[PDB]
Design a protein around this ligand. Structure first.
Ligand SMILES: Cc1nc(N)nc2c1nc(-c1cn[nH]c1)c(=O)n2C(C)C
Length: 841
């Protein structure tokens, strides 16, 4: 079929990698997974409601918060229905269904209610208070604008036509030798690993370091063939003592067969603990990489793989073990305790990650007992889903499919709003899966095909990894292709325009970067005008905001910015004529910063805002849109009406460390029309400042430069450029005299706003502390999947101190107030030093 072959070249263009390309494979796992996923894909496409899928209603089950309830008139919401040039406002009870909001339009004085200017529809049996746009409208005090129109054709989402246990011998590997085409002493270290657990360790004799070093040794391991668990790795490492190269091979394949034969595995080098050290993929660059030659006995061959009481002090020992943070290491005593009292540990879902890390995986009867333990899962299965507990079972410490599957089972019960909250980190969690085909990969795939919004983000999350990870590109490319073959031609067409546009805008960014002024300013418009001609589509969906349709460029407004990395400031017209405003879509296109790092941080800010929403706290964070498109390249959402803290100083001062305290509050009044607005801008400042002080403190990205703190003309403060301190790594946070001056404090003093501040801080900080485990795991996972070199295990443990684990609320309240005071003690010291360092040298 030729129309099927041309379609593969389109998929290959959308993916950014050729999924058929067999040059970098040593087995059919990727083919077996491409084939393996055909069923979940066909089962979700067939099960989905075409109408609900066509319109992707964005709904939450969460109770409407208090701060949103108080903003109500009196059990009444004002919805402004539009049409052509007619606009009739209707009073509607928060509990009112959008179907009845038509019955209160066709009887009060077939057709769908779409938001004005957005591809966002208010459909299905859900109270309007439960729509995410509605809740967004209440928060920002915006008006609920709806334009009545026709439901999209669900025929546009049309999808195109489609024994190991009996051999008691000790395991062995023959290390033939290693070869590097260019250029000491050298040894091969072979390890039998099961999720961070090293079952056995062998080494070769140190030979001289030459372009070809041979051994012909049979390395015998202490573990028997029968004791090998499904998920075990053979980790090959080259030392010279300094590690230089690594490669991994799964011992038991995707078919449950033990590994036999000859393998020439090309090796991954070491640059400069992370997820890339765990890859089953081989280095694609053959011409320059080091390879290892090995043999595994191709024998016959096919070897396939198939309560009482407790003393007070022991129970008190177990309880103190179970109620410990995810990062506290377990000692051999703790592990022996947990395992002996395993049936008692099962009644405590919180214990599962610690109980499963007590299992000796290099022992078959032990692993068999662990399966008996999982058949008595009841408590876990019954319990109210805990994400932080679920994620602990998806980390690098778990290599058993069955242990991992119980966490994926817990995720099935997540509503879409929640899937979107944890999507970026569930996608990064795929890097920890022993096999390409997993319960997690299938989960991600089902959810994306079931919802266009999860699907839009899945695509960019996966695309970003395929574009910049050689260790994971193959695995991700197989999940992307599986998604793209079940989303619809409408989605396929959407993704097409987006890729086409973003790929053009990346060329522009890099060409402009090369020339580094009057000369450059010209080239900008010169290049942008050629694109707007015909090749570039009329409009395109915004990758960080799928609800928006970005039309033609505002060439006039578009500019190259004054920075080391020369970024593009682009402006786009809203392609939707139903838009209640002529406000542009501002996007920054940048090369230099690692936007992967920003994304991970931005997503943690969203989770922190959600932890605050559950405890009636709105800390006014601005976690702006950010989509990494490739290596050190991607896009940033422009936050409107915003300046940097440094430029505000540069205004009433001028390119010096002479930092005036008066400056901020001045600019705030200068940019406020009424004093009612100024009071609210100060109210926003106090709230946003506490939020970034706490968040920044917890994440440990607190010591920042003024140039990386932004403020809106409406008082909202926000941090920018996270992939800069994390890109290349004192005060706990930025709480400068200009910030304290806005709060009504000069030197060591107190005011009604500074007391307001400290109370919000302590409330916010104690709210995050109730989610210790969750924040720890996320932080730990972000460091492993997204942070290069910033690992060690010690960088991870920073979060324990910040979250003040082990301490009580009163002691925690005390600890945060100290930090607030070290900010007052330092004043402008750190800022002036940052200016000295960054601006000068
Ligand atoms: C969210 C955001 N908004 C605005 N108005 N400007 C930004 C920005 N974000 C970044 C940024 C975020 N990560 N890296 C840069 C940025 O540099 N700027 C300017 C100073 C041009």
């Amino acid at each position: 079929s030729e129309e099927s072959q041309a379609f593969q070249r389109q998929l290959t263009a959308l993916i950014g990698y050729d999924v058929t390309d067999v040059s970098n494979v040593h087995d059919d796992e990727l083919e077996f997974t491409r084939r393996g996923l055909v069923t979940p894909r066909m089962a979700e496409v067939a099960s989905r409601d075409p109408k609900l899928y066509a319109m992707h209603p964005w709904v939450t089950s969460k109770p409407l918060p208090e701060y949103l309830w108080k903003k109500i008139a009196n059990n009444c919401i004002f919805i402004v229905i539009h049409r052509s040039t007619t606009s009739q406002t209707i009073k509607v009870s928060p509990d009112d269904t959008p179907g009845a909001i038509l019955q209160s339009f066709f009887t009060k004085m077939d057709f769908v209610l779409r938001v004005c200017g957005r591809d966002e529809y208010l459909v299905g049996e859900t109270p309007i208070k439960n729509f995410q746009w509605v809740r967004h409208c209440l928060k920002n005090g915006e008006e609920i604008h709806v334009v009545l129109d026709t439901p999209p054709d669900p025929a546009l989402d049309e999808v195109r036509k489609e024994s190991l246990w009996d051999c008691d011998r000790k395991f062995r590997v023959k290390i033939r030798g290693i070869d590097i085409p260019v250029l000491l002493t050298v040894f091969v270290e072979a390890n039998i690993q099961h999720g961070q657990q090293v079952l056995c360790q062998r080494r070769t004799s140190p030979k001289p370091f030459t372009e070809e070093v041979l051994w012909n040794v049979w390395l015998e391991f202490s573990i028997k063939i029968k004791d090998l668990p499904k998920g075990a790795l053979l980790n090959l490492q080259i030392y010279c003592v300094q590690l230089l190269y690594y490669v991994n091979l799964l011992l038991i394949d995707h078919r449950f067969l033990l590994r036999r034969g000859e393998y020439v595995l090309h090796m991954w080098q070491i640059s400069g603990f992370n997820a890339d050290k765990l890859t089953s993929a081989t280095n694609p660059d053959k011409e320059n990489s080091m390879s290892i030659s090995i043999l595994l006995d191709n024998y016959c061959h096919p070897i396939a793989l198939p309560r009482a009481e407790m003393p007070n002090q022991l129970r008190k020992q177990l309880e103190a073990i179970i109620a410990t943070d995810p990062l506290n290491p377990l000692t051999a005593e703790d592990k022996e305790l947990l395992w002996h009292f395993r049936y008692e540990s099962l009644k405590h879902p919180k214990a599962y990650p610690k109980l499963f890390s007590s299992v000796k995986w290099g022992q078959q009867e032990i692993v068999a007992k662990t399966y008996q333990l999982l058949a008595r899962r009841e408590v876990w299965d019954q319990s109210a889903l805990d994400v932080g507990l679920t994620m602990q079972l998806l980390d690098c410490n778990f290599s058993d499919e069955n242990v991992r599957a119980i966490a994926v089972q817990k995720l099935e019960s997540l509503e879409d709003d929640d899937v979107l909250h944890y999507l970026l980190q569930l996608v990064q969690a795929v890097k920890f899966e022993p096999y390409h085909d997993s319960a997690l990969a299938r989960f991600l795939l089902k959810r994306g095909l079931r919802n266009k919004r999860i699907g839009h983000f899945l695509f960019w999350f996966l695309r970003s990894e395929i574009a910049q990870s050689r260790h994971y590109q193959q695995r991700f490319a197989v999940i992307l292709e599986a998604y793209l073959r079940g989303c619809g031609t409408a989605m396929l067409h959407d993704f097409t325009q987006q890729v086409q546009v973003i790929e053009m805008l990346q060329k522009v960014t890099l060409d402009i970067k090369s020339l580094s002024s009057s000369q450059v300013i010209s080239q900008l418009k010169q290049k942008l005008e050629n694109l707007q001609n015909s090749q570039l589509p009329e409009s395109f969906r915004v990758p960080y905001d799928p609800g928006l349709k970005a039309g033609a460029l505002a060439i006039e407004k578009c500019k190259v910015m004054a920075s080391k990395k020369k970024p593009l400031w682009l402006e786009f017209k809203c392609a939707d004529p139903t838009a209640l405003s002529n406000e542009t879509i501002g996007i920054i296109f940048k090369h230099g910063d690692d936007l992967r790092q920003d994304m991970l941080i931005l997503q943690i800010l969203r989770i922190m805002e959600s932890i605050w929403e559950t405890e009636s706290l709105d800390l006014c964070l601005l976690p702006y849109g950010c989509i990494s498109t490739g290596d050190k390249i991607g896009m940033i959402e422009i936050v409107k009406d915003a300046t940097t803290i440094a430029k505000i100083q540069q205004s009433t001062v001028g390119n010096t460390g002479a930092f005036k305290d008066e400056v901020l509050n001045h600019w705030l009044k200068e940019k406020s029309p009424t004093e009612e607005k100024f009071q609210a801008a100060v109210e926003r400042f106090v709230y946003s400042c506490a939020g970034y002080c706490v968040a920044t403190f917890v994440l440990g990205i607190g010591d920042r430069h003024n140039d990386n703190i932004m403020i809106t003309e409406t008082g909202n403060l926000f941090h920018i450029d996270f992939g800069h301190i994390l890109g290349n790594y004192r005060v706990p946070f930025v709480l400068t005299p200009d910030f304290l001056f806005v709060m009504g404090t000069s030197g060591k003093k107190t005011s009604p706003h500074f007391q307001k501040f400290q109370d919000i801080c302590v409330k916010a900080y104690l709210a995050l502390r109730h989610h210790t485990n969750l924040l720890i795991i996320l932080f730990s996972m972000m460091l492993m999947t997204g942070m290069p070199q910033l690992t060690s295990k010690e960088d991870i443990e920073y979060i324990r101190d910040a979250l003040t684990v082990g301490k009580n609320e009163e002691d925690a309240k005390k600890y945060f107030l100290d930090q607030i005071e070290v900010c007052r003690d330092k004043g402008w010291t750190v800022q002036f030093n940052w200016f000295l360092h960054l601006v000068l040298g």
